[PDB]
Write a structure and sequence with these properties.
monomer; Phosphorylase Kinase, domain 1; 2 domains; three-stranded antiparallel beta sheet; 12 helices; globular; binds phosphomethylphosphonic acid adenylate ester; binds magnesium ion
């Protein structure tokens, strides 16, 4: 029968063989495999979303976005395997280039030189420039979603929480709550849970930069509200100006009830870090999202001056627009759209 990895069927043969476990998640599993047609090794992400509406919604977004993107610092889709009929489609298999490791794993076994930190950060922001220019928010940037090779090429993966937010329309009040992984969650995800912006991805990049400098997460909260206390424990209490910018009255009143905390200087937390890196970290980990540095300005910061070149940093040819955001649909309909969207890889097409 078809190959198995840790009790999970991977119905991908005969093209793809020699399956080995790489990782997993809430409704999927990732393996390495050998592509017998192209004579290369690939990654295969099995995704099983069809029992739940939210999983279907996210799977359609991930597939649509990754198929349209083409960029050196974003993982591509090479192939998609699924059953020839919608009644038989229980799973979707996304075939991608195999990368050697991710940044989470690298940081467990290795302290990184400034040279490497600098190069990785450049690549994260070059990809994010492309993602933001497409009017996409990633919303789950963290070390385990950054893939790395031995040549230090970096690719952003895991667009499972990603979405489109067309800036022609005010999205305040319509965005999903509780996005990102806790430690990489900007303050406004807690204080403005339905009206945050792409600025949340810059915060996550800041957290990643911090983690590359010390090999430990900067804001390791244990639960929703504790995360915010960890943030304020380093940044200090927000100024009155930054409080006045918080539109939600009960979030602003909640902050006004908290005890005063002083700013911990960056050089005290990272005494051996390059000074330009800390200046950039500061601007990324700025409490007020309106004052927080944007991706293009971050690329032009002096820390990345040896790599910055806007003639070699593509933006999206065709940005996503509002029409394709209308995906709050029953799971049966989402399955049909996923079936349609993956048809370009079927023999019959
Ligand atoms: N193309 C690839 N090459 C090598 N490793 C990969 C890969 N794609 C994913 N991985 C590895 O598998 C892990 C899980 O992949 P991914 O994050 O896409 O799955 P997932 O979305 O189900 C987990 P979650 O939903 O919690 O983010 C990654 O952290 C990474 O280590
Ligand atoms: Mg992930
Ligand atoms: Mg994911």
């Amino acid at each position: 029968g078809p190959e198995m990895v840790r009790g999970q069927v991977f119905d991908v043969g005969p093209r793809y063989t020699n399956l080995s476990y790489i990782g997993e998640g809430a409704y999927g599993m990732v393996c390495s495999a050998y592509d017998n047609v192209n004579k290369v090794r690939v990654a295969i992400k099995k995704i099983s979303p069809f029992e739940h509406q939210t999983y279907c919604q996210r799977t359609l977004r991930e597939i649509k976005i990754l198929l349209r993107f083409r960029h050196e610092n974003i993982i591509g889709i090479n192939d998609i395997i699924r059953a020839p009929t919608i009644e038989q489609m229980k799973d979707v298999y996304i075939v991608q280039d195999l990368m050697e490791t991710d940044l989470y794993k690298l940081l467990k076994t290795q302290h990184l030189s400034n040279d490497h930190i600098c190069y990785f950060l450049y690549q994260i922001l070059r990809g994010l420039k492309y993602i933001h220019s497409a009017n996409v928010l990633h919303r789950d940037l963290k070390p385990s979603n950054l893939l790395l090779n031995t040549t230090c090429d970096l690719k952003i993966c895991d667009f499972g929480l990603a979405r489109v937010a067309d800036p022609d329309h005010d999205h305040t009040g319509f965005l999903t709550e509780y996005v990102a992984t806790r430690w990489y969650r900007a303050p406004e995800i807690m204080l403005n849970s339905k009206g945050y912006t792409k600025s949340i991805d810059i915060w996550s990049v800041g957290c990643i930069l911090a983690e590359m400098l010390s090999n430990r997460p900067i804001f390791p909260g244990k639960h929703y509200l504790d995360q915010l206390n960890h943030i304020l424990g380093i940044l200090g209490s927000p100024s009155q100006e930054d409080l006045n910018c918080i539109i939600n009255l009960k979030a602003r009143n909640y902050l006004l009830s908290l005890p005063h905390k002083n700013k911990v200087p960056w050089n005290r937390l990272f005494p051996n870090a390059d000074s330009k890196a800390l200046d950039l970290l500061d601007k990324m980990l700025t409490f007020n999202p309106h004052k927080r540095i944007e991706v293009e300005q971050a690329l032009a910061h002096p820390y990345l001056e040896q790599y910055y070149d806007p003639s070699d940093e593509p933006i999206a040819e065709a940005p996503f627009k509002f029409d394709m955001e209308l995906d709050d649909l029953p799971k049966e309909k989402l399955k049909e759209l996923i079936f349609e969207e993956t048809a370009r890889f079927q023999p019959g097409y």
